[PDB]
Structure formats: structure tokens, C-alpha cells
Design a protein around this ligand. Structure first.
Ligand SMILES: [Mg+2]
Ligand SMILES: [Mg+2]
Ligand SMILES: [Mg+2]
Length: 254
DNA sequence: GCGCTGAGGAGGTTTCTCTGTAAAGCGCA
DNA sequence: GCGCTTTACAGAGAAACCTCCTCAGCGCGC
């Protein structure tokens, strides 16, 4: 779909993918990969359908089932992948990976010896304002949600029937990123920093739940895979929790 | 024959997802 | 000292992420 479905794909690749250059005996593998749960096989084929390229693979890691999409053909990466990531840049320090990948690829580095040593900085490239004000952000955000968002419902206490209903999203070395999301979506809950510099944003209130629901109705593109399914079953649950349904215009198709 | 390729395959570590627990603010009594 | 509702904090492990190898086969020219 859309031109901004490509922006959605960069968000999804930012959340769940990886750029990598790996030794291959005497030479190199340049790759862009995403490996998802088998719950997401249909989305893997929607991604290949959008890009027109990429090898699909299955893995059983002995009881967890996994699907990958991997682009390794260097002419295809130069032609089709870099431009997407030029036109719609990643917002986080995963941009450092695209920049080293792009520089290596375009310089024609083919041996480990000529490959510059890479350590990905923890320091952000953008500000809140710079993230929030770019034209493609909301479309990026649907894919980043596709990758990293969580919609859940849970009992507040074992003994009662009081249900919570939360949306939560996290990123390591992601103060700015996550705060930008908080800002844009008018969330006011405190971002939590854990032992491993992973910033975590979680919301529960009626108004915040009303805010993400409204953002995803009005966003340029929609959720496509298993998060889309998680989104609909959450909504299902939401229609039967009084505080939410008697204050939110919930449903739709999608 | 030779330099180099990527599909197909797989070993290794950890960031997110998902679901809370404990504590409390609001308002009413 | 109680319904209802929200939030600061955080743990487990599945779902992400990161890394390397073999071997047909290609596109040249000795
Ligand atoms: Mg991620
Ligand atoms: Mg992730
Ligand atoms: Mg994910």
C-alpha cells in the first residue's frame, strides 16, 4: 500500500529488524533481516510483497517457531533498500547501523580487514521536536508499534474482577525516542528507566487508551500482522469493561 | 581456474513484549 | 478507612536480535 507504507516498513524494521555485515570465511555478508514469531508468517509475506525482494526462512529453536526475511543481494540492497532508508530515515541510534551499513556497502568493502570497526553509539541523533515534526512520523509509528507495542488486559488483583487494559512500548537507549512518543500521543505517565538503560512507557487510563485508539484510526496506514490481531482482541475486551466503553467510541472495521 | 557471490543453514545473546505488585490519589461518607 | 481508578516500578522469557559457515554457480580470461 501507500508511499508511507514504506515509512511504516522502516518503523517495523527499526523495532524488529537488523542491518548486519558478517564475516563469511574470507568475504562478507551484507544483510537486512527481520525475524519474527511464526504468528507473523503472513506479515513476512506481506513485507516481501511490498519490497519485491528477500529470502524467507523457517526455524524451530527447538520449540519456539520463527520466520525470517533476509535481504542479502547487494545490487538489490543498493537499488531498493538504501533509498527507502534514505527517504524515510530511522529516528533512533539504530540509524548508526544503517549509516555504517550504507558506507561499507557503497565503498565496496568485501573483506573483514577493510571493514571499519563498529561500535554503535548510545547517544541519540534527533531531538523530541525533530522526531515529532517530520512528515512521515505517524506512519513510522504504526510500524514501530507493529514491532514494539503491546496491547494487554489483566486483573488488578487475583481476588477481584477489576481489569486494567494497557498499552506499553519500550526502547533501549531510547529516552528521546520514547519521550517523543509520549509527547506526540499526549501521554503523561513517567517513563521508567531500568538496570539496562531500557526506557519503558506504559498507559492504562481511559483518556490514554482513548488517545492510542484515536491515533490508529486517524494514522495514514494501519497495523498489518499479529499486533493488528492483538489490537482487535484488546478492543474486544474493551467493549466489556465499563469505564472504557462508556467513555470511548471504540470499534470500526480494523 | 579463480575470485567472489548469496541461498540455505544454523549457533549465540538479549531487548523488548506481557503481565503484573504494591501503593496510592480522588471523591464521597 | 472504602469504591473506583490510575501509576511507579519491575521481572520472566519468548520473541527478537546478532553472528558465522558451506557450497553450487557465475563471469571472466590463460
Ligand atoms: Mg526493537
Ligand atoms: Mg524489538
Ligand atoms: Mg515485536
Amino acid at each position: 500500500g501507500s508511499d508511507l507504507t514504506y515509512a511504516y516498513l522502516v518503523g517495523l524494521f527499526e523495532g524488529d529488524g537488523y542491518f548486519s555485515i558478517t564475516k563469511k570465511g574470507k568475504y562478507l555478508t551484507y544483510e537486512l533481516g527481520i525475524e519474527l514469531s511464526i504468528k507473523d508468517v503472513q506479515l513476512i509475506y506481506k513485507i516481501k510483497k511490498i519490497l519485491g525482494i528477500g529470502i524467507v526462512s523457517f526455524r524451530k529453536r527447538n520449540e519456539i517457531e520463527m520466520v525470517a526475511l533476509r535481504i542479502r543481494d547487494k545490487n538489490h540492497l543498493k537499488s531498493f533498500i538504501l533509498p527507502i532508508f534514505e527517504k524515510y530515515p530511522m529516528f533512533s541510534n539504530k540509524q548508526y547501523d544503517y549509516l555504517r551499513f550504507r558506507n561499507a556497502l557503497l565503498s565496496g568493502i568485501i573483506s573483514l580487514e577493510d571493514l571499519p570497526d563498529y561500535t554503535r553509539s548510545d547517544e541519540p541523533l534527533n531531538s523530541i521536536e525533530s522526531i515529532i515534526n517530520t512528515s512521515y512520523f505517524s506512519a513510522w509509528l504504526v510500524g514501530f508499534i507493529e514491532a514494539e507495542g503491546c496491547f494487554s488486559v489483566y486483573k488488578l488483583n487475583k481476588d477481584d474482577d477489576y481489569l486494567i487494559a494497557s498499552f506499553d512500548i519500550a526502547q533501549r537507549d531510547g529516552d528521546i525516542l520514547i519521550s517523543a512518543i509520549r509527547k506526540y500521543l499526549s501521554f503523561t505517565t513517567k517513563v521508567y528507566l531500568d538496570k539496562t538503560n531500557c526506557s519503558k512507557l506504559k498507559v492504562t487510563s481511559v483518556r490514554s487508551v482513548e488517545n492510542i485508539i484515536k491515533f490508529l484510526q486517524n494514522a495514514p496506514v494501519k497495523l498489518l500482522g499479529n499486533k493488528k490481531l492483538q489490537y482487535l482482541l484488546w478492543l474486544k475486551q474493551l467493549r466489556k469493561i465499563s469505564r472504557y466503553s462508556e467513555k470511548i467510541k471504540i470499534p470500526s472495521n480494523y
